[PDB]
Write a protein that binds this DNA or RNA. Structure first.
Ligand SMILES: Nc1ncnc2c1ncn2[C@H]1C[C@H](O)[C@@H](COP(=O)(O)NP(=O)(O)OP(=O)(O)O)O1
Ligand SMILES: [Mg+2]
Ligand SMILES: [Mg+2]
Length: 430
DNA sequence: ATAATGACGCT
DNA sequence: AGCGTCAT
């Protein structure tokens, strides 16, 4: 209609590093470059857990969450790089710092929301405006978009992969109105030019390659990102959404990958995101609640309002370790020693946080899991975090959990713990 | 025995 | 507060 908002107000991108931990290890060790290789965590149980996989190794069917011993069965020449271990646990420091390299480069172009160790959303709306006045309304050359796909294109009245990409990009640019500075399609296009630049800057300055999605909101940008990996970027326009969603499995949309996703499918009897359009907002609210219903109604029309939160850094700092199977902690001395190992890494990261990012935490959350309980957390308790001191933090954590011990002989611990988790929260300026 | 973390919703 | 959900 004439009064219906179409969710084309913003230009939003999602940048995602390609096989990130592998690229970090390949940059450090050139022997691993352009080879089937994976990053593995621990190693005694079945060779350690695979947690990142180069595209060369993915062709052999190697995937994350696979034992390395099993990965070698699919790919005997697989090269492995191991995650650093400190105080008996995985230490991800190298990857955090690599991540900071990328995040700081992105921050030069626009405001970012860190979404994970290797992903960031970018609100490009302002950057695009000023680039549009700078560009004096001359056509946007395809040379400014050498790694960009236009989703849905080419269509209409042709065997080469890159050939296809160019065809669609040509069709898109030929159709574009540089006339209207407020045309959403034009804005996304300029957005993509900027992300081409941002992605060139990251590769030049860190050596890392990435993929990106450019669209009008977070969910579509994140969806766009995954359409042409690795080392490519995809523009999903508002107009592309109906065909794209028509065979897009519901579970693929961000936040619908779990139980709400499954219940949308089960209760409504549908499979694809586009099928949601046939229901009224009130019907969707009645089934999934007021907030989920409103979100769904809009999202299935490609409309979403979640803003890019201006935060390049975390707001909790935590350390955890699982103790699967036979390694479950069953003596009080064990529990105390591991609480201390966790507290020591935590103090380290915290001290760095106070120096670098000018800040102190004021609360400590202690989380454990008991054997057999197959939730992430069996129990969560809090206490004051007054001193960045590992022995006090570990002692305090024990204190707020020790009554969970069912054991008659309290030299021993029952039920056994299969997870310890310490998390610094409630940060303040300093 | 697919980890180690982080953010947010509900009550 | 403390637990449940979703994510990389
Ligand atoms: N189950 C897991 N266990 C341990 N570490 C993991 C993990 N999943 C991811 N990581 C670590 C390791 C990953 O490198 C990093 C990024 O996660 P992604 O972006 O989801 N996956 P990637 O970047 O590898 O591949 P691509 O984006 O090209 O699909 O976080
Ligand atoms: Mg990635
Ligand atoms: Mg990621």
């Amino acid at each position: 209609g004439p009064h219906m908002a179409t969710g084309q107000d913003r230009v939003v991108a999602l940048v995602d590093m390609d096989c990130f931990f592998v690229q970090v290890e390949q940059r450090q060790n050139p022997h691993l470059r352009n080879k089937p290789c994976a990053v593995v965590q621990y190693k005694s149980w079945k060779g350690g857990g695979i947690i990142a996989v180069s595209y060369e190794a993915r062709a052999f069917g190697v995937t994350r969450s696979m034992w390395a011993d099993d990965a070698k069965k699919l790919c005997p020449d697989l090269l492995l790089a191991q995650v650093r271990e400190s105080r008996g646990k995985a230490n991800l420091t190298k990857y955090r710092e690599a991540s900071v390299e990328v995040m700081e480069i992105m921050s030069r172009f626009a405001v970012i929301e860190r979404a994970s160790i290797d992903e960031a959303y970018v609100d490009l709306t302002s950057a695009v405006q000023e680039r549009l006045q700078k560009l004096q309304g001359q056509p946007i050359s395809a040379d400014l978009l050498p790694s960009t796909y236009i989703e849905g294109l080419p269509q209409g009245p042709t065997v080469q992969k890159e050939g296809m990409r160019k065809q669609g990009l040509f069709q898109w640019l030929d159709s574009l109105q540089i006339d209207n500075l407020t045309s959403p399609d034009l804005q996304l296009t300029v957005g993509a030019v900027i992300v081409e630049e941002m992605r060139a800057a990251i590769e030049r300055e860190t050596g890392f390659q990435c993929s990106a999605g450019i669209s009008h909101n977070k969910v579509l940008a994140k969806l766009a990102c995954g359409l042409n990996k690795p080392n490519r970027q995809t523009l999903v326009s508002h107009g592309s959404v109906p065909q794209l969603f028509s065979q897009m499995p519901i579970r693929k949309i961000r936040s619908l990958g779990g139980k709400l996703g499954a219940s949308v499918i089960e209760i409504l009897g549908i499979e694809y995101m586009g099928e949601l359009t046939q229901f009224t907002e009130s019907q969707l609210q009645s089934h999934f609640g007021e907030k989920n219903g409103s979100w769904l109604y809009a999202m299935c029309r490609g409309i979403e309002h979640d803003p890019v939160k201006p935060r390049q850094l975390p707001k909790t700092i935590g350390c955890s370790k699982n103790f699967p199977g036979k390694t479950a902690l069953a003596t009080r001395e064990q529990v105390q020693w591991w609480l201390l190992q966790l507290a020591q890494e935590l103090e380290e990261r915290l001290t760095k946080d106070r120096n670098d990012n000018d800040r102190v935490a004021t609360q400590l959350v202690v989380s454990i899991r008991v054997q057999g309980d197959k939730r992430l957390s069996s129990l969560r308790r809090c206490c004051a975090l007054t001193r960045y001191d590992a022995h006090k933090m570990s002692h305090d954590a024990f204190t707020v959990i020790k009554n969970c011990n069912t054991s008659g002989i309290q030299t021993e611990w029952s039920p056994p713990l299969t997870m310890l988790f310490l998390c610094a929260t409630k940060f303040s300026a300093s």
